Symmetry: C3
Subunit: 60 residues, 3 copies
Amino acid sequence: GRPILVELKNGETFNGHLENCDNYMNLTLREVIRTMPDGDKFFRLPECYIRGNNIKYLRI
Amino acid sequence: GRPILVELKNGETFNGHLENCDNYMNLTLREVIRTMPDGDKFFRLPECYIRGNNIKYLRI
Amino acid sequence: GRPILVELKNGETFNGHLENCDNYMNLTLREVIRTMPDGDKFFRLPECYIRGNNIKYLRI
């Protein structure tokens, strides 16, 4: 799966296309939908980098 | 009004063009300017979805 | 310099090309990389406005 959904420890989720990932799960997503715990969303974030340490889980 | 300004309960404002609104005031804005309570702004957010429950008021 | 790095009092940094600055250090950056204290980043923010009162320091 290039499109993945990443849930952060802070409760946010990022839904985007996987561009890079390293052995520590630091990763980059493109064309991202960011969903807040309160239900608000932001669409079409060009690119987001997420530290492996900040991730709760990832679903493909 | 297609361009509207939405002020959230968390103090942020979103200024963009109205794309959709439902009977619960869940709405979508495009080409949005987001203003933080501390004055910082982010321009040209492609699309934001805001839950009616998170809105304080809307100005047209 | 046009590319500058702005560190905010809230610990975030904004790395982008300087568009405007005023005598109070309210400024505008374009094509910006926003880095969070926890190491997550957002790339290619079209434009950000930052209030002088929110800035800790600026590096060119």
